[PDB]
Amino acid sequence: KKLFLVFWWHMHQPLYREPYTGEYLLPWTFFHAVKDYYDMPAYLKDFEIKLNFNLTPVLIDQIQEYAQGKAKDVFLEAIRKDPDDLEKEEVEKLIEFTKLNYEKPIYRFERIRELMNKEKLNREELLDLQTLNLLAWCGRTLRKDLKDLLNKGRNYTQEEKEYVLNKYFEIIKKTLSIYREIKEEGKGSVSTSPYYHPLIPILLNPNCVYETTPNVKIPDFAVSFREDASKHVELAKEKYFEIFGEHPVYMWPPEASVSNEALELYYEKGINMLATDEVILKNSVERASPYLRYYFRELISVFFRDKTLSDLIGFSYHAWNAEDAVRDFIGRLKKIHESVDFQPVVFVVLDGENCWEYYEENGIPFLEKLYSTLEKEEWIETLTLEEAMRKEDVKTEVIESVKAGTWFDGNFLKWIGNKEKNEYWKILIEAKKKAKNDYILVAEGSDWFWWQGEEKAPFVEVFDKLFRSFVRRAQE
Ligand SMILES: C[C@H]1O[C@H](O[C@H]2[C@H](O)[C@@H](O)[C@@H](O[C@H]3[C@H](O)[C@@H](O)[C@@H](O)O[C@@H]3CO)O[C@@H]2CO)[C@H](O)[C@@H](O)[C@@H]1N[C@H]1C=C(CO)[C@@H](O)[C@H](O)[C@H]1O
């Protein structure tokens, strides 16, 4: 009697490329590419387990642009330059980026603490600030290859910085290749999402928000987004087809967001299985066990992630020592295994790149111990999405209706329902009436609405510039 364990690591960035200048106004795609997007699948080179991944099409587009040498990344240019060539504005951006990241364990260099205590930085201090920002985002693979430069911690030269940059771009250039490799080796399945990571249930029917939050105010949706919802899914199938050579049959719904109408759309577009959140299941059925494969109206298979386990990795275990965290996680799997007489399917589904910066050593001791342990546990079998979808010795249940929501409290309030978020929807609605090109799809991404109207969101001015620039460009 096995426990079936399914990891599904979701990878996404919104489009940081400003459409009029072509400039990447934030470096987050570059930094998560060199830290996470190659290294997370590359664990499969060292550990005999299965791991699955979601890649959004808009993330893939940007990874490609960086790999081809065509991304004009303004923050990265401030890092690359000799400090004597830095603009006043660039020194400020560097310092402010450091301030934002200063307390994360991956930034634990005493030299960074020194540099932020200084009133004015000379050329050598700015080289250290530049290079330590780079090295803070070093991924597992190059953490081994560049170990000696990392331990130096100070006194970096321009040549050493450029060496690190070149190795980082080598990692980016091999990123799509490693997803193709682990896929064709059967070591993991790769899914995608609707193209720009929108909230499909809202695009199909904004009234679905009242299924969970009847008191919310939303703007006047005087235009239909139903066709755009279909386009996000169809364009995502095409982008995935181009990269991996087949149409995707697994999709991760952005923000775990489902509704009865969204599930119908995914079915109509040929998607065979998706996953969503345990809160949705609890809101939708009485006996809400996440350890079964569900069939929505006999149309499409649905797994509900184990929210506790997913949240322990995503939010809890950074505050734990690595050995104790793995002990805790394995202990919880043992409890699940002996809590049922059938073989439970245990989906662990979360962002694949955002939690690690808060762990010691970028989460590498944790994942190395976790994967080493799982590799050898005889009562656990990790599965690909394909194996989970087609496995015969599991329990199943039919579901006729879901209550529309997301994995954030089972509702849509993180993206709609206050004056500032509603203003973005109003802007989008107005622009859609006059839209002439697919930049309107870019502006439908969930990310713009998440950062709008929030207390101190970092660089929200940049997200705002991007959203409004895409909305402007969509009408031209
Ligand atoms: C400002 C923020 O930008 C970057 O964050 C991006 C994430 O890295 C991406 O993975 C993507 O996240 C979305 C997920 O895919 C989705 O599943 C859901 O979880 O929503 C996410 C938000 O839409 O897109 C993000 C940008 O939209 C950057 O990587 C990240 O570090 C930056 N976070 C800063 C913000 C705050 C306050 O919230 C601090 O807590 C962080 O420490 C800062 O680094």
TrEMBL record:
The keyword Nucleus does not apply. GO terms for molecular function: catalytic activity. Gene3D superfamilies: Glycoside hydrolase 38, N terminal domain (3.20.110.10). GO terms for biological process: carbohydrate metabolic process. Residues 6-397 form the Glycoside hydrolase family 57 N-terminal domain. The keyword Ribosomal protein does not apply. Keywords: Carbohydrate metabolism. InterPro entries: GH57_Enzymes, Glyco_hydro/deAcase_b/a-brl, Glyco_hydro_38_N_sf, Glyco_hydro_57_N. It comes from the Bacteria. Belongs to the glycosyl hydrolase 57 family. This is Glycoside hydrolase family 57 N-terminal domain-containing protein. The lineage of its organism: Bacteria, Pseudomonadati, Aquificota, Aquificia, Aquificales.
